[PDB]
Amino acid sequence: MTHSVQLKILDKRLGSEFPLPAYATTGSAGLDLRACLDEPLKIEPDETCLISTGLAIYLGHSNVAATILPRSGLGHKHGIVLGNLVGLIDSDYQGPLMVSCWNRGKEPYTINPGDRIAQLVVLPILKAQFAVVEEFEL
Amino acid sequence: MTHSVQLKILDKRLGSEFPLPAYATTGSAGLDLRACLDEPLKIEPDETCLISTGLAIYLGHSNVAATILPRSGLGHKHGIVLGNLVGLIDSDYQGPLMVSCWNRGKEPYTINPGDRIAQLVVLPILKAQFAVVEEFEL
Amino acid sequence: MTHSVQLKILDKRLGSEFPLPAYATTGSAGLDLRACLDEPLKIEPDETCLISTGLAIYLGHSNVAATILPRSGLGHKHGIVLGNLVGLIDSDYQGPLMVSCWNRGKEPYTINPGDRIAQLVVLPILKAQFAVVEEFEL
Write the CATH number for A106: 2.70.40.10
Rounded to whole angstroms, the Cα distance separating C19 from C31 reads: 11
CA B20 vs. chain centroid, Å, equals 13
Judged on CB neighbours under 10 Å (0-12, 13-18, 19+), A73 is exposed
CA A134 vs. chain centroid, Å, equals 40
Q: Is A1 near chain C, with CB under 8 Å?
A: no
Termini Cα distance of chain A: 32
**Which residues are registered as beta bridge partners of C66?**
C89, C122
Discontinuities in chain C (C→N > 2.5 Å), after residue: none
E-assigned strands of A27-132? 31-34, 41-43, 48-58, 64-69, 80-82, 87-89, 96-103, 109-111, 116-124, 127-132
If one counts every other C-beta atom within 10 angstroms of the C-beta of residue B72, the result is 23
Q: How many domains does chain C have?
A: 1
Helix (H/G/I), strand (E/B), else coil: C105: coil
Longest dimension (CA), chain A: 59
Rounded to whole angstroms, the Cα distance separating A37 from C46 reads: 30
Contacts of A16 (CB under 8 A, 6+ apart): none
Identity of the residue in B31, B69, B81 whose CB atom sits nearest the CB atom of C128: B31
If one counts every other C-beta atom within 10 angstroms of the C-beta of residue B13, the result is 16
Rounded to whole angstroms, the Cα distance separating B63 from B128 reads: 11
Q: Is B106 near chain C, with CB under 8 Å?
A: yes
E-assigned strands of B10-134? 31-34, 41-43, 48-58, 64-69, 80-82, 87-89, 96-103, 109-111, 116-124, 127-132
Range of the domain at A6: 2-138
C72–A87 CB contact, under 8 Å = yes
Locate all alpha helices (DSSP H) within B1-138, ordered by sequence: 72-78
Backbone angles phi, psi at A10, to 5 degrees: -100, -20
Strands A41-43 and A80-82: unpaired
Binding residues of C for substrate: 71-73, 84, 88-90, 98
Strands B2-9 and C127-132: parallel
Termini Cα distance of chain C: 32
Sign for the CA dihedral angle at A132, C15, C99, C55 comes to negative
What is the rounded (10 degree) CA torsion for C84, C90, C92, C97?
A: 40
Q: Nearest CA to B55 among C130, A25, C126?
A: C130
Using an 8 Å CB-CB cutoff, list chain B residues near C129: 2-5
C129: closest chain B residue by CA: B4
Method: X-ray
If one counts every other C-beta atom within 10 angstroms of the C-beta of residue C128, the result is 23
- The C-alpha R_g of chain B, in whole angstroms, comes to 17
